[PDB]
């Protein structure tokens with residue numbers, strides 16, 4: 001609770017507030033020549049391991065570590081269960097670096113007991129585009145918790161990123177760290193109502209029977225945008241144009257290349273869904289969501305919470321409410337239990353009328369080595385995985 005590590009880093013202190021025009025690094029004029037060239041030292045018995053996520057053996061070790069040891073909610077009901085495919089997809093975006101996928105092994109057993117990763121991305125923050133590392137999947141094995149391994153993982157990936165002449169990073173966390181640039185509550189639209197109530201994800205309102213809740217939280221009968229279809233390769237430049245134009249209104253967003261659109265949006269069953277309303281090669285509307293199940297801890301009636309997470313949604317032919325109603329239906333049609341979304345972009349406006357419930361927490365957006373004013377989450381135009 002006292003931030004002994006984080007207050008040594010170029011991030012804001014917890015009570016810092018910055019003026020409305022500053023937009024620049026905390027530590028500027030960095031020189032690659034000054035970056036530590038060797039890996040940070042580890043205690044005897046532990047070693048760094050650069051992972052090849054395209055290799056089945058390495059990927060399996062990452063998958064096993066995260067499945068057993070990655071993020072849990074604050075009541076330890078759920079643990080994220082990113083698929084091995086999702087991990088491959090998330091980590092091998094265009095121009096990724098294998099040397100930014102770094103683990104720590106326990107030498108005696110040759111097992112992976114720590115991990116952190118980054119991928120490169122261009123991030124526009126308050127109208128300035130900066131090449132950044134997007135950091136994700138920080139994880140320490142449960143048996144090695146509270147041994148200060150996380151600061152070493154963070155410092156080591158920072159070194160590896162700095163060696164590429166990159167000095168800023170973006171990341172999200174459900175925990176409060178110094179210091180969010182924005183903080184977005186999450187909301188959910190129940191689809192498989194009885195399951196969500198039985199596992200403790202949702203509460204049954206005291207005025208409702210289970211049977212009535214199932215009826216009341218039914219989804220729309222048919223699409224508002226009836227021509228929706230899965231995205232195809234030929235749609236990449238059209239999605240690039242539609243999404244790229246939409247995102248320029250926000251204070252924080254990724255500046256996607258055509259290659260990045262193809263990577264992040266072309267569909268992969270049970271990983272990433274993108275639907276488009278296309279006419280004469282123009283993409284008029286798009287819906288996208290990704291698949292991230294949570295293992296339901298200690299519950300033998302169900303295995304996973306099969307959740308869809310809102311990604312990027314843009315409409316020109318409907319209202320935003322109609323678009324997001326269609327997103328919920330498309331998730332339901334693909335057998336998802338729940339549709340989760342953040343109060344970013346225009347999402348907040350739809351939550352009441354589309355019968356979303358408010359979640360039990362918020363997702364914090366962070367920048368490393370960047371000084372600027374924080375802002376309300378409606379100004380956030382990026383969804384991290």
Ligand SMILES: CCCCCCCCCCCCCC(=O)SCCNC(=O)CCNC(=O)[C@H](O)C(C)(C)COP(=O)(O)OP(=O)(O)OC[C@H]1O[C@@H](n2cnc3c(N)ncnc32)[C@H](O)[C@@H]1OP(=O)(O)O
Nearest residue numbers: 003004005006070137138139140145146147148149150167
């Ligand atoms: C220019 C390039 C820069 C690149 C780097 C950019 C920064 C990237 C930052 C990483 C972005 C990650 C994005 C994601 O992946 S967020 C998801 C994080 N992972 C999990 O929640 C999985 C389950 N939990 C664990 O695996 C461990 O509990 C973790 C690994 C979280 C801590 O391990 P452990 O419990 O064994 O603790 P320790 O003794 O080793 O270390 C204690 C220190 O760790 C600080 N801590 C705790 N939780 C987090 C957290 N979620 N982000 C950052 N720091 C965190 C804490 O403040 C303390 O420092 P201080 O309080 O003394 O200051």
Ligand SMILES: Cc1nn(C)c(C)c1CCOc1cccnc1-c1cccc(N2CCNCC2)c1
Nearest residue numbers: 071072073078079080172173174186294340385
């Ligand atoms: C159903 C469920 N399962 N688990 C394991 C949880 C925590 C939930 C609650 C629902 O949480 C969200 C709902 C919507 C969006 N984001 C989250 C969210 C919340 C906390 C942390 C993360 N991480 C770490 C940072 N990087 C992205 C992923 C994500």
Ligand SMILES: [Cl-]
Nearest residue numbers: 054055056059
């Ligand atoms: Cl493979």
Ligand SMILES: [Cl-]
Nearest residue numbers: 071173174175
């Ligand atoms: Cl977290």
Ligand SMILES: [Cl-]
Nearest residue numbers: 209210211212
């Ligand atoms: Cl009932």
Ligand SMILES: [Cl-]
Nearest residue numbers: 256257258259
């Ligand atoms: Cl391009």
